[PDB]
């Protein structure tokens, strides 16, 4: 099973936030550490995406675009899985050195969003998602958000996304049983998008007022949040839902 070999091989290992757990849980320290982690994760997402089967067939500008658009959803999805595997979704396992308890969820002013992310994490338990299903779903998530008036080479994108959907189908099939499962997984994938949108809105708002609340944004983060995220929030770039 070549495809699954590759997905396991390229999956990133442990990423630390660099969080000084000895300092008090303030808004500014928590979010500054979350932003540092976000950037470290983005670096890993780039290396992961570029090594995916077929990804290099995409026009290079489209390669950069889909990574930037999907980044937030990819991070949320993977964090949900870490949270499930490490702490049975009882807390948010952003990193080994940055695990959110209820106090941090409140102090970060992200409580409601954290609740939604914890619910996503719990889905991995409720649906008994396998590691293979998780990997294929995560790869599909990369191909689940595009500009409304299209990519530079939309046709190559459409073909690739089709092939990633087929691979998910094969993983399930490994007839009514398959059908039910595919429905459950596409529904789970759709459910990432509203959560990602809420995080996008929160992150954008935070960037705007960041100088006022003493929250640090790394330069590359600040670039993507100010250049790409508003394309999503203004509706120029939208998720591809399975279910209408």
């Amino acid at each position: 099973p070549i495809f699954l070999n590759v997905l396991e091989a390229i999956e990133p290992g442990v990423v630390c936030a660099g969080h000084d757990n000895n300092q008090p849980d303030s808004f500014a320290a928590l979010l500054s550490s979350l932003n540092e982690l976000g950037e470290r994760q983005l670096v890993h997402v780039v290396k992961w995406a570029k090594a995916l089967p077929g990804f290099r067939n995409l026009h290079v500008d489209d390669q950069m675009a889909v990574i930037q658009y999907s980044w937030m959803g990819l991070m949320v999805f993977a964090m949900g899985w870490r949270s499930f595997t490490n702490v049975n979704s009882r807390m948010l396992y952003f990193a080994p050195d940055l695990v959110f308890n209820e106090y941090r969820m409140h102090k970060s002013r992200m409580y409601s969003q954290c609740v939604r992310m914890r619910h996503l994490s719990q889905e991995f338990g409720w649906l008994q998602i396998t590691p293979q299903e998780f990997l294929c779903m995560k790869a599909l998530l990369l191909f689940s958000i595009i500009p409304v008036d299209g990519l530079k080479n939309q046709k190559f994108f459409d073909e690739l996304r089709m092939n990633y959907i087929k691979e998910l189908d094969r993983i399930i099939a490994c007839p009514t049983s398959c059908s039910r499962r595919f429905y459950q997984l596409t529904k789970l994938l759709d459910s990432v998008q509203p959560i990602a949108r809420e995080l996008h809105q929160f992150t954008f708002d935070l960037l705007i007022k960041s100088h006022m609340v003493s929250v640090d944004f790394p330069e590359m983060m600040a670039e993507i949040i100010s250049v790409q995220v508003p394309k999503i929030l203004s509706g120029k770039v939208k998720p591809i839902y399975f279910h209408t």
Partner: peptide
């Protein structure tokens, strides 16, 4: 072009 720099650097 911070992101482009990273994309091409890796």
């Amino acid at each position: 072009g911070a992101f482009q720099n990273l994309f091409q650097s890796v």
